[PDB]
Amino acid sequence: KTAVDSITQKKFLCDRTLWRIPFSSNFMSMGALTDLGQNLLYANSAHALD
Amino acid sequence: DATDPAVRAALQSQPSGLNSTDDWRQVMDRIMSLTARNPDAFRQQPQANRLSAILEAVVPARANPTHEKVLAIVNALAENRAIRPDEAGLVYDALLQRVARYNSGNVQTNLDRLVGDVREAVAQRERAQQQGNLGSMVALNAFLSTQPANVPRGQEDYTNFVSALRLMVTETPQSEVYQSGPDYFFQTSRQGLQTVNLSQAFKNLQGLWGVRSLLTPNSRLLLLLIAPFTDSGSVSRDTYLGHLLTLYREAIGQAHVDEHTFQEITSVSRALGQEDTGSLEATLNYLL
């Protein structure tokens, strides 16, 4: 009955893992050679990554 | 020639004028004024245009056929559906890069053999489209291996039906057969309706070849499509399948003359003066 006015802190811990961002057009694993890696295949085009 | 991958490559790489390398004889007929139409059109040019064509004629300039040999190959891959039309610039730079890494006297001869090979392969596919038989005969004969060659009753009706079944896929280049799971099918055209089910029809007609409310409507759809390819003596007269094949030939012939009757009645109902809504409904109820 005498609870103080409180504020909620939310967080997560996700250990042991790597934040995977797949270079696929729907972020799914439809194969090891993804569909966005085959559009750049035989392209002979260098792209900057920032 | 509009579907020739080396004529199309000449309309995309070769100049649209008369250079003295690709057209040496046609420009020497004009330099030496021995042309039939306008012989003196070369004397009436300035020295910048007249002497620069004489120098390219007595000692002509060499050129690279490599961008023209590869572009004939790319424009045949894009025509036989091997690549997409969006990939026509991707595989063109991919093939030009490969014949630049590995350029030789062997490879330029081998590209010269392959631009005559893709002229044939484009024409061989376009002959096979208008014939329309090779994809269907190997899959209808594959169907008829599954069906038994000896029905108990009415074998005379059965072996002429399956011979008329080979007559639809031969004498219609758009029609095809295939498989999708267990059953086989028959489309009367590419991307068209009236698809019969061959494995369901021949498990329905089996047991009806000598019988003399009981037919699945795709079997009756098969007996409608097979009707113009069946003679009066191909099947019997008293047999219930043979009685319907004559009845479906009369239904096609009546629908072929009710088509011409429709084009006559509605033509003389507009000029005589009627409702255009009711001219088109009273005609069908007179014809159906």
Curated annotation (Swiss-Prot), chain A:
It comes from the Viruses. Signal peptide: none annotated. Induction: Expressed in the late phase of the viral replicative cycle. It is found in: Virion; Host nucleus. Homotrimer. Interacts with the capsid vertex protein; this interaction binds the peripentonal hexons to the neighboring penton base. Interacts with the hexon-linking protein; this interaction tethers the hexons surrounding the penton to those situated in the central plate of the facet. Interacts with the hexon-interlacing protein; this interaction lashes the hexons together. Interacts with host dyneins DYNC1LI1 and DYNC1I2; this interaction might be involved in intracellular microtubule-dependent transport of incoming viral capsid. Belongs to the adenoviridae hexon protein family. Major capsid protein that self-associates to form 240 hexon trimers, each in the shape of a hexagon, building most of the pseudo T=25 capsid. Assembled into trimeric units with the help of the chaperone shutoff protein. Transported by pre-protein VI to the nucleus where it associates with other structural proteins to form an empty capsid. Might be involved, through its interaction with host dyneins, in the intracellular microtubule-dependent transport of incoming viral capsid to the nucleus. All late proteins expressed from the major late promoter are produced by alternative splicing and alternative polyadenylation of the same gene giving rise to non-overlapping ORFs. A leader sequence is present in the N-terminus of all these mRNAs and is recognized by the viral shutoff protein to provide expression although conventional translation via ribosome scanning from the cap has been shut off in the host cell. This is Hexon protein. It comes from Human adenovirus C serotype 5 (HAdV-5). The chain holds residues 853 to 902 of 952 of the full protein.
Curated annotation (Swiss-Prot), chain B:
GO terms for cellular component: host cell nucleus; viral capsid; viral capsid, decoration. Residues 1-103 are annotated as: Peripentonal hexon-tethering domain. The modification Phosphothreonine is found at T261. Residues 11-21 have a biased composition (Polar residues). Cleaved near the C-terminus by the viral protease during virion maturation to form the mature protein. Induction: Expressed in the late phase of the viral replicative cycle. Residues 1-21 are annotated as: Disordered. Keywords: Capsid decoration protein, Capsid protein, Host nucleus, Late protein, Phosphoprotein, Viral genome packaging, Viral release from host cell, Virion. The keyword Phosphoprotein applies. It is found in: Virion; Host nucleus. Residues 135-238 are annotated as: Binding to hexon-linking protein. Disulfide bonds: none annotated. Structural component of the virion that acts as a cement protein on the capsid exterior and which mediates the interactions between the hexons, including the peripentonal hexons, and reaches all the way to the penton vertices. Two hexon linking proteins IIIa, one from each facet, stabilize the unique edge interface between a pair of facets. As the virus enters the host cell, hexon linking proteins IIIa are shed concomitant with virion acidification in the endosome. Interacts with hexon proteins; this interaction tethers the peripentonal hexons to hexons situated in the facet. Interacts with the penton protein (via N-terminus). Interacts with packaging protein 3; this interaction is required to promote correct genome packaging. Belongs to the adenoviridae hexon-linking protein IIIa family. All late proteins expressed from the major late promoter are produced by alternative splicing and alternative polyadenylation of the same gene giving rise to non-overlapping ORFs. A leader sequence is present in the N-terminus of all these mRNAs and is recognized by the viral shutoff protein to provide expression although conventional translation via ribosome scanning from the cap has been shut off in the host cell. This is Pre-hexon-linking protein IIIa. It comes from Human adenovirus C serotype 5.
